[PDB]
Amino acid sequence: IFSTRAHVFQIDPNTKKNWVPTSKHAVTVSYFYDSTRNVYRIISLDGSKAIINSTITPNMTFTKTSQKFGQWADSRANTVYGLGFSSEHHLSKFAEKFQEFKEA
């Protein structure tokens, strides 16, 4: 698996233009292979909340919007997740893993 830190956001449902903070601080975000479903997943837990529970689908894409912000649409969750990183370095390894775990 692979874990990292990031502030989480979701696009606003009404206009799908503005970002709404999901976490109040940075939280752990991990790529995990679920051996019970045989699929790769991106999860982020905060307290009793599963703020990210995205299953990676071959037609999913991760966009590096800026130096420290990346995002991906998840039709199952009916939203778009946005992650803010502490550096472009972290944004990059997150993006490369997205493609790696997608490619499998």
Partner: peptide, 6 residues
């Protein structure tokens, strides 16, 4: 556009 300062 991303949330600041990202």
């Amino acid at each position: 556009t991303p949330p600041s300062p990202f």
